[PDB]
From a paper:
Here, we visualize, for the model phage T5, how host recognition and SE can be achieved via the interaction of different phage proteins with the same receptor in the Escherichia coli outer membrane. The receptor for phage T5 was identified as the outer membrane (OM) TonB-dependent transporter (TBDT) FhuA almost 50 y ago. To elucidate the mechanism of SE via potential TBDT structure modulation, we report here the cryo-EM structure of the FhuA–pb5 complex and the X-ray crystal structure of the FhuA–Llp complex. Our structures show that the phage lipoprotein Llp exploits the known allostery in the plug of FhuA in the opposite direction as during ferrichrome import (i.e., from the periplasmic side to the extracellular side).
Llp is bound to the periplasmic face of FhuA and makes extensive interactions with both the plug and the barrel. The total interface area is 1,640 Å2, with 14 hydrogen bonds and four salt bridges. On the extracellular side, the conformational changes in FhuA–Llp relative to free FhuA are dramatic but confined to just two loops, EL7 and EL8. Both loops fold inward to completely occlude the plug domain in Llp-bound FhuA. Importantly, the effect of the EL7 and EL8 movements is that they will prevent the high-affinity binding of pb5 to FhuA because of extensive clashes with the FhuA binding loops of pb5, explaining our in vitro data with purified components and in vivo data from the literature. We propose that Llp has jammed the plug of FhuA and that any TonB pulling does not remove the phage lipoprotein from the transporter.
Numbering used by the authors:
A (entry chain B): 1 to 62
B (entry chain A): 38 to 714
Write the structure that this text describes.
Amino acid sequence: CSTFGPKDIKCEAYYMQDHVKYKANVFDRKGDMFLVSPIMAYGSFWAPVSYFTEGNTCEGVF
Amino acid sequence: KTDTPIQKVPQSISVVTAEEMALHQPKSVKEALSYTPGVSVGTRGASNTYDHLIIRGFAAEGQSQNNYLNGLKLQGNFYNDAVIDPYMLERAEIMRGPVSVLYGKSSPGGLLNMVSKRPTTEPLKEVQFKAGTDSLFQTGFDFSDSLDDDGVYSYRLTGLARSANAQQKGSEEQRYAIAPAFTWRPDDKTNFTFLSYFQNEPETGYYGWLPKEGTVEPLPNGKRLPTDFNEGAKNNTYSRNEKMVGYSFDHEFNDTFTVRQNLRFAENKTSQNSVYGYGVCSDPANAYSKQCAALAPADKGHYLARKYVVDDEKLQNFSVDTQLQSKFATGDIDHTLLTGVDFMRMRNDINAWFGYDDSVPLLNLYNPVNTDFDFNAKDPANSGPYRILNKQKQTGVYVQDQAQWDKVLVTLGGRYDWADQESLNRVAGTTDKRDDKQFTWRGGVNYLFDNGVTPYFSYSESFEPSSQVGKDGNIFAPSKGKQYEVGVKYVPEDRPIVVTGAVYNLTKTNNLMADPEGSFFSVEGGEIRARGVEIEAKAALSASVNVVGSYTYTDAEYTTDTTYKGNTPAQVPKHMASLWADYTFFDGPLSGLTLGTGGRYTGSSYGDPANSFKVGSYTVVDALVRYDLARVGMAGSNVALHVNNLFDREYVASCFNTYGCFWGAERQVVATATFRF
């Protein structure tokens, strides 16, 4: 339903919870907040670039 | 060496975060979760005294607070509860239909798990100013950073100072909160986060009743009461002080074992010297009122008879939860076993003095003359003391496992509680002692599709204790719940949307509908069976627009109360929905503007247990605007304006009986200026 989708995924991020490292699919970036979309991670679409451990693949956005 | 697995166990389907908190800056936790499904928070109307809410018909724990705060059960008993300002909260999630047994002591339907603001290893220097209508001026300060290069030692100090003039003319609201916090994190498998909270509220605000007359039905004159009518006296005071200290600890030994322990020592206390209205002389109540009897049959319709109450309480709470996480795997069925114990010690000393019928004079309504009152007068004919001391001790062992097979997840847990309770009436020397022993278990099954679709069905129980107490020290029976919940959640791996739906059949026993005809001392009643459907839609249509919507159907009746058997409880709307959206004008002439607007609807609700009169359906519209000073050089700093009830609609929120209704909230404007360094 959203304008985005599975093809508009730019990069992936990494975060830890329950002492295991996980992944999150990232989209656009606003200042210092990523638009990650697993939802089951930060609880909101617009998550700040701090909840993650190694953005890595998100080194090229602008 | 895989691409690292994303998350797929359905979580955080209703959390509001700091990014959502700093965008709405809710005046209270009554807001924030104002647009989340399954909750109706405008039940009290316009009163920052308590933060109660109706999830699936049933409200707060023993009517006190069914909410959690960094684990544990918050606290509260006999009107001495704890409130927390959202400015001290990093995350405030509302969990509808929890399948865990750690929440078995809570309601099977809903739960508000609040999370304090944790220290950040990154420098945060925030200063917030927000001011607007009704002499409102809240000043915030939040400063967190690390203390060493590795970040093993980190700190956080958040604090609040709000003073405001309540809507009801004569009542003031003042809250001063400060929460120190510290976090020690040597390695990645150890954390000892210390959390404390200190809040002094010299004036809680307004907490009174208004008859069904001028509120919902035109008064004898033909007009209706004003939106800001204070039926109490000028010297009405209402204070509260909360002191909390605790920690949250967790350590992972092997990749199969993990220990966790949570703790909190709280010391909450409150004092009240207020006069509350008990309906006009024409009300079915009073009747035996002498002041109301000496009136003509035409003047009894516009003369409000009231009562007064003086109270002083002191709470000492202690809570402990210690669990062990065993993450082994049998055959090809992975496991995550939780084994823990909890503890609880409560102690509340009530030294109150109540006022019976004809304890105060009468208000004219057409010509109110709200004066002062001698709360220190103890006339033996209209007043009476109530010196009670309540003590509780609960101890429950819980075991829960989350078994995973291929794409099937089954959540199953079981808990056994040893609940003790003791009350002492200092007047008649009566000492009641109630020890209960009950088993409760929760179980949920769901299937995990690859795209994110997840249909689930769960059976929920609960051993929710009784928080309140009755006149003469009646230890209420604990409440036992039973809920059948089925539904389907969509947690997409790829696209940024969220849609979930559910239908439930919750049944809770030994419920208390309060109001033993006379006095607000509450009364025992029958069980309630609640049925309804909740749906939620949370997505981000393009980068500029974010949308959130929800609808909640609710149908509950008394099951075995004979008197009101087969009637819907008051303050519960049948239909309920809300919707909100916000645009972000980035990359443009106004790169920084963030325009947002939304509306809330609450269906028709009943006003008394006998279902005599009905409260009309209302619709409130909010809006807000926010511009980030990125064009001036202040990255992260923004100035925002907030409007609640845009068109200013006069509505009655809900009523508990004929002699008590609650006016809504008029238009509120707030100008926020938060700065980050």
